[PDB]
Amino acid sequence: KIYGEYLMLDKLLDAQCMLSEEDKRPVHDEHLFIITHQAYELWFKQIIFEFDSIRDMLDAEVIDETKTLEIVKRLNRVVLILKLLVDQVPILETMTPLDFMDFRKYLQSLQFRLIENKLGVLTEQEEARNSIRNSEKDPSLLELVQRWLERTPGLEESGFNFWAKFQESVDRFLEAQVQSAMEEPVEKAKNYRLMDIEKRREVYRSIFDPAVHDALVRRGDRRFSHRALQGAIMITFYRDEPRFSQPHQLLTLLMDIDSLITKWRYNHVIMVQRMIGSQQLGTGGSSGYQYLRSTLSDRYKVFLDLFNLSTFLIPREAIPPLDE
Amino acid sequence: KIYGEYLMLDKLLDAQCMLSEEDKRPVHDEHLFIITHQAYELWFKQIIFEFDSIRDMLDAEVIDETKTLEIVKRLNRVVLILKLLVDQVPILETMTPLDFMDFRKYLQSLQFRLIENKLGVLTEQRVRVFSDEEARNSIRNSEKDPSLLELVQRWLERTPGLEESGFNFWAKFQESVDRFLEAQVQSAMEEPVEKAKNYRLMDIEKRREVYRSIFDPAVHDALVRRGDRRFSHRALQGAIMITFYRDEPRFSQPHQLLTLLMDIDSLITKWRYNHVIMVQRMIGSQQLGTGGSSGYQYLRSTLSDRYKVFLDLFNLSTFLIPREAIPPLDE
Amino acid sequence: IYGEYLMLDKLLDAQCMLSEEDKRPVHDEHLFIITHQAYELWFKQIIFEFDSIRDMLDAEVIDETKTLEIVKRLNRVVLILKLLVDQVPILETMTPLDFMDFRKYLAPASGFQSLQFRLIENKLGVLTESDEEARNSIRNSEKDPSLLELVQRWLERTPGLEESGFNFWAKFQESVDRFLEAQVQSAMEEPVEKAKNYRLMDIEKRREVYRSIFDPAVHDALVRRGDRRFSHRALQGAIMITFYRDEPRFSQPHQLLTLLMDIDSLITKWRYNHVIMVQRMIGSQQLGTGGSSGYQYLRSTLSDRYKVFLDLFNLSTFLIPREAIPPLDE
Amino acid sequence: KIYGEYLMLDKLLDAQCMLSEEDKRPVHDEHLFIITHQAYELWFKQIIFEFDSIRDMLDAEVIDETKTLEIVKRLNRVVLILKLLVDQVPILETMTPLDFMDFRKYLQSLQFRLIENKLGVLTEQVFSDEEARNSIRNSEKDPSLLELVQRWLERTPGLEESGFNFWAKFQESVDRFLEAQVQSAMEEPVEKAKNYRLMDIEKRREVYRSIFDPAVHDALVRRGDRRFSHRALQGAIMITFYRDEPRFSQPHQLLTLLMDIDSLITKWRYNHVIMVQRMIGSQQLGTGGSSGYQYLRSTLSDRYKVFLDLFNLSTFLIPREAIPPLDE
Numbered sequence A: 001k002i003y004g005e006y007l008m009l010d011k012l013l014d015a016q017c018m019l020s021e022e023d024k025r026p027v028h029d030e031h032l033f034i035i036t037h038q039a040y041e042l043w044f045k046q047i048i049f050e051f052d053s054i055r056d057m058l059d060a061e062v063i064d065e066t067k068t069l070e071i072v073k074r075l076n077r078v079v080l081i082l083k084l085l086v087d088q089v090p091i092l093e094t095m096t097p098l099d100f101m102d103f104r105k106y107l108q109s110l111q112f113r114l115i116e117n118k119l120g121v122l123t124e125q126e127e128a129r130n131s132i133r134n135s136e137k138d139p140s141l142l143e144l145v146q147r148w149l150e151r152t153p154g155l156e157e158s159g160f161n162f163w164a165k166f167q168e169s170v171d172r173f174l175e176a177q178v179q180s181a182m183e184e185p186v187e188k189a190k191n192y193r194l195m196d197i198e199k200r201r202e203v204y205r206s207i208f209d210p211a212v213h214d215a216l217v218r219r220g221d222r223r224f225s226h227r228a229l230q231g232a233i234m235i236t237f238y239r240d241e242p243r244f245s246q247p248h249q250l251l252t253l254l255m256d257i258d259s260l261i262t263k264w265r266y267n268h269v270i271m272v273q274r275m276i277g278s279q280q281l282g283t284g285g286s287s288g289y290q291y292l293r294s295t296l297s298d299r300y301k302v303f304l305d306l307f308n309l310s311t312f313l314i315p316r317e318a319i320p321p322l323d324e
Numbered sequence B: 001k002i003y004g005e006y007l008m009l010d011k012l013l014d015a016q017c018m019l020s021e022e023d024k025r026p027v028h029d030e031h032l033f034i035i036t037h038q039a040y041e042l043w044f045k046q047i048i049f050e051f052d053s054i055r056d057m058l059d060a061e062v063i064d065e066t067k068t069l070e071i072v073k074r075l076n077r078v079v080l081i082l083k084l085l086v087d088q089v090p091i092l093e094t095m096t097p098l099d100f101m102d103f104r105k106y107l108q109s110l111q112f113r114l115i116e117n118k119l120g121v122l123t124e125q126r127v128r129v130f131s132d133e134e135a136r137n138s139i140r141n142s143e144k145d146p147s148l149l150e151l152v153q154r155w156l157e158r159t160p161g162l163e164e165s166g167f168n169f170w171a172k173f174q175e176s177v178d179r180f181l182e183a184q185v186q187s188a189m190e191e192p193v194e195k196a197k198n199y200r201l202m203d204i205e206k207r208r209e210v211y212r213s214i215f216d217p218a219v220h221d222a223l224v225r226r227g228d229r230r231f232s233h234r235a236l237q238g239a240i241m242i243t244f245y246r247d248e249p250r251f252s253q254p255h256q257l258l259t260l261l262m263d264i265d266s267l268i269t270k271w272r273y274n275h276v277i278m279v280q281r282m283i284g285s286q287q288l289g290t291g292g293s294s295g296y297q298y299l300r301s302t303l304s305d306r307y308k309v310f311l312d313l314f315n316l317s318t319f320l321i322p323r324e325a326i327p328p329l330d331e
Numbered sequence C: 001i002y003g004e005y006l007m008l009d010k011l012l013d014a015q016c017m018l019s020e021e022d023k024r025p026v027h028d029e030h031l032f033i034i035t036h037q038a039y040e041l042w043f044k045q046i047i048f049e050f051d052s053i054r055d056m057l058d059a060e061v062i063d064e065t066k067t068l069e070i071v072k073r074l075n076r077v078v079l080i081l082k083l084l085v086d087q088v089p090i091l092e093t094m095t096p097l098d099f100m101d102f103r104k105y106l107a108p109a110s111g112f113q114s115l116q117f118r119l120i121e122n123k124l125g126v127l128t129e130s131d132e133e134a135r136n137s138i139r140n141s142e143k144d145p146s147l148l149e150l151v152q153r154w155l156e157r158t159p160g161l162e163e164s165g166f167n168f169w170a171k172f173q174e175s176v177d178r179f180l181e182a183q184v185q186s187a188m189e190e191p192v193e194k195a196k197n198y199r200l201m202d203i204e205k206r207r208e209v210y211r212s213i214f215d216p217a218v219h220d221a222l223v224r225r226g227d228r229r230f231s232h233r234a235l236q237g238a239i240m241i242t243f244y245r246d247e248p249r250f251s252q253p254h255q256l257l258t259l260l261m262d263i264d265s266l267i268t269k270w271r272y273n274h275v276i277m278v279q280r281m282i283g284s285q286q287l288g289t290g291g292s293s294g295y296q297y298l299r300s301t302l303s304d305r306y307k308v309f310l311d312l313f314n315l316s317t318f319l320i321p322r323e324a325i326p327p328l329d330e
Numbered sequence D: 001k002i003y004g005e006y007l008m009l010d011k012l013l014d015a016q017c018m019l020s021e022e023d024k025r026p027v028h029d030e031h032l033f034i035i036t037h038q039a040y041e042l043w044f045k046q047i048i049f050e051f052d053s054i055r056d057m058l059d060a061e062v063i064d065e066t067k068t069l070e071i072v073k074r075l076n077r078v079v080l081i082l083k084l085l086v087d088q089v090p091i092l093e094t095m096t097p098l099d100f101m102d103f104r105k106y107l108q109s110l111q112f113r114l115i116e117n118k119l120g121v122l123t124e125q126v127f128s129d130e131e132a133r134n135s136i137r138n139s140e141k142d143p144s145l146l147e148l149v150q151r152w153l154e155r156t157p158g159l160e161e162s163g164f165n166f167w168a169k170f171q172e173s174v175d176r177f178l179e180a181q182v183q184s185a186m187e188e189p190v191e192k193a194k195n196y197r198l199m200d201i202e203k204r205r206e207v208y209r210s211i212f213d214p215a216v217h218d219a220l221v222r223r224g225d226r227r228f229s230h231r232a233l234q235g236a237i238m239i240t241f242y243r244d245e246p247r248f249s250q251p252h253q254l255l256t257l258l259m260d261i262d263s264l265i266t267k268w269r270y271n272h273v274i275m276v277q278r279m280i281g282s283q284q285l286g287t288g289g290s291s292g293y294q295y296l297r298s299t300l301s302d303r304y305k306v307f308l309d310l311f312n313l314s315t316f317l318i319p320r321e322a323i324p325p326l327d328e
Ligand code: HEM
Pocket: A036, A037, A040, A041, A092, A100, A108, A109, A112, A268, A271, A272, A275, A276, A288, A289, A291, A292, A295
């Protein structure tokens, strides 16, 4: 009921134990190290709580406008929490490498891994063991978003039939581009345009040929199923329409989360290099540092497909108009 | 020690208990409410830890360049932590007023008060408390033991350059002001435009009134009693001196210390403002249970300069004279 | 052609240090010019966005598609304002003595400092309590409908307010009456006498709150007094949107109100940051200031007299629980 | 004298020309595109101005505590300007890819290149104007911040053999420290821990070989892993060891701000490359493949980090009690 009892500050403000102070050789900056890590872990619990509720909302065959708005609110909340965590790195960077060296002797996160897994970081790229097992077995946000995207209204052949209208629009647009390039007076400009239209033909081949798409998914360049990519492309085309404005905001927030997780990884790896360099006494070489540098690759970006959707764009007047 | 054992996550990640979930009427945003408050309390413990160490360092007759640098490191760390706490308000603002209304039924901080007291928020300024004996002892000690405001004043009073036998800054400053203002009167007398001439002469008179408030200790003492100033006359002399020679290596780090104290003060007001806007967005000026707009109006009164601890430091630029008017450093 | 497109031969030719001209150069004068010109470029952008939002609101029909574009442009202004608040610490890098060495070349302003800053204040809807092109600009910004006036007209036409249709205001008054009656009966059953009286005193405070909105004469008195700006029907529409903000129909109109409040808050955050910088550079008064009159004027701009959408901030005072709010039928 | 005359707003507020509005097919977001770019260019002119003054201050045989403080003020100012410019990307990201596509038909920076060159981005890792050609020529010929910082680092007091002789004392401290570590690892009761420590001490010996053998350092400079001269790296290491001492606190802050500038230029490059992919993808109509996008992704590599050596200085650190104490 009262502030301290409600927030359980007798439990929370009792979890700070400096091992340098315990060994009667105290290092002042060890308190900062503990608090910073515990602030991260509190916000990790919050991110997991939000993610689990969004997963339960996405694990339904019908996701109405009302549930969609609540998913957008919670994805945006996670975006704000991630920005706060990126800003916590410069606070720990206040500690000197020599101060850190004086308590390092007494020294990853279950919650960070649960976030990676629940978001959709692919594994091929006892209470704690059960938690990690369930986070890999149960559907991630990447899987649940794909199923949502696959059921996007406008994709069905009987209804709006977007993919078929898009292939036809592309064909007529590229034909008009070839005729325009043929009328180019300068020969150099004419050839540049014709070579460019050929590059466009290759781009559309990667989406209009399911075999080419499946090859890229197996290769690791794509994660999304063919139909989820169709739904994602459709939403990006009609994002200015009220029907698709909120679904697009959902995709946008997923990309913002992905980008912010990489911004944390980068800020963390720069802090590691400022504190202990590429290697230091106890590191056993630069293996740990080099591992952290490999987490900055696109193999760790979950919604990798969403970032490239603008490659497939056609002008407003080339896009098939909404009928319904 | 392993990660979870070192950080005591079995204790830390077990302090979250939603009373709406307990009463089988759960409100999802109650988890956010608890975590946000607990993140504030973790950083409050950090701020207190830093403040206590800076206080212990300032509680000495000799504060060398090396201790000064460590005080600046820790003050700057607090500045970063305060910016982080100002940014936590928009996260809680994500909660809707109707969601908050559904768990408010089950509902200030000892640590926030310890920060206010240790920084130097004067007990006689608080606009119109804790039953625990450990909490009562904490608040008693924070009021009895010297605050950062008291310790900084003693440091400022002992600033080398103030002593009459040595550099004698205050006497050289009064002489510089007198000659500068006389030269301004002669320059204003040769003004061709009559309107500009009178404006300059009226302006030089406003300057004379400013210097009266610092060169007459009785006028200063009146402002301290009035509440417009907190600093002792000699601490204000030292603060003014540091701001004049801030570009000199001797005074660059002391000036950075004053600057960080002002930044902390400004950031505490930025939190107070952000908090009061969030309170109005959640429950308005008054709501069912509030018993009027008393609580909201109290929070609006904490935005006044009666709550700014290093109030004197903000005004130091009012006493500034040009580079060519300032007495040069000899030693 | 990058340089030709952006007209960098015109843009990068507008920087002239008068200290360098007088053969007594001050390095930080370049920062002073660039910082001010960065502000003025973003002021031109804010005015451009505000004028387009005003044109979109100056219509009897504002569809979902135009509403979304208004929200995009209001949010863009919110980002530009946050960026301008962050430009103050860059100018605060300059020392007061460096500033003092070039301040001589500056003129103090006859009325408003920046024409563009005043055009923003006027176009948003501030009551602010010198050339023919500039005079015409400021005249038109005061005469033509501000964002405050145009938003009020939009709020007045909110679907759900009409008596023939949903009739929200009448259902709200009835819900309040029954809610407060239930609260009185609940307070009457309180065993502790101190708690019972607290609840009955509190219900009386609530009765007064609802009197200020359910009696148009009490509302009109507060508008004349300056405590409120909104018309009675605009406040009804604003209250309605805040009650059903979780419903898709009212989620975007609520986002529009939210962004207007964010802009208002950010303009006050700039005013505060600017006033702190002024005090760090020249104090409350300095040579040329002629007393602390200019500084004290800047401190008076921090009051709620300068907040345009003042009514929107207090809307949560009128809230009733989820189960007390009349359900949406249509 | 007056506000508009002083800031030349008749010139500044007249440089905005939308080509979509000119062609009677206006795109509202083109105004944002112009203003955002012009805001970048105004701050580029400021960064160049600060860099040129810091270069003039570093182009002296004597850099006293007073000049050092002014260099730190201006480096920290550039750090704030760079943070501001990283935050301008999300404002342009407000524009939709389809709105951008409707004016892209009417469409790098001389100032961005001048910053890259003046900071020290090596040309071994386009403009036909005569004024622009002279500018880029001079930015490559005149000493960059990387060259001038190296010269300053080389003359760091405490490195001279006659004086404090830091490098010789550091080699001796390392030798005794690592020997003590071997003796301590030999007495390890657990065999797994004993072997781990001995393997680790060997990794440390290889680290110190790269700094105590000038031939190994020169090989890394030629290989591209390092840029700094051997003596500049000695000075940089020395400052990082005694950063808590008043004598070295401000020189260390200077190195720290150079790394912050480097990191912020990479944060802009990353934010810019994400915005490009959100607007036009890896390739689009007119791009002629994904060459431009792939070029921008290659600018995120450590080949574009100027003060690359400064980031790794913590690899050479020894404990407080192992560092030779300051005498003077
Ligand atoms: C003094 C500063 C820090 C240093 C030097 C540091 C160093 C390292 C190193 C070397 C690793 C690689 C794994 C290993 O070899 O053990 C690592 C991983 C990790 N650290 Fe840090 N760390 C620091 C601060 C933090 C903070 C403040 C957090 C936040 C809670 C954090 C969270 C993690 C996580 C979650 C991983 C795993 C990353 C992944 O799997 O991609 N570290 N750290």
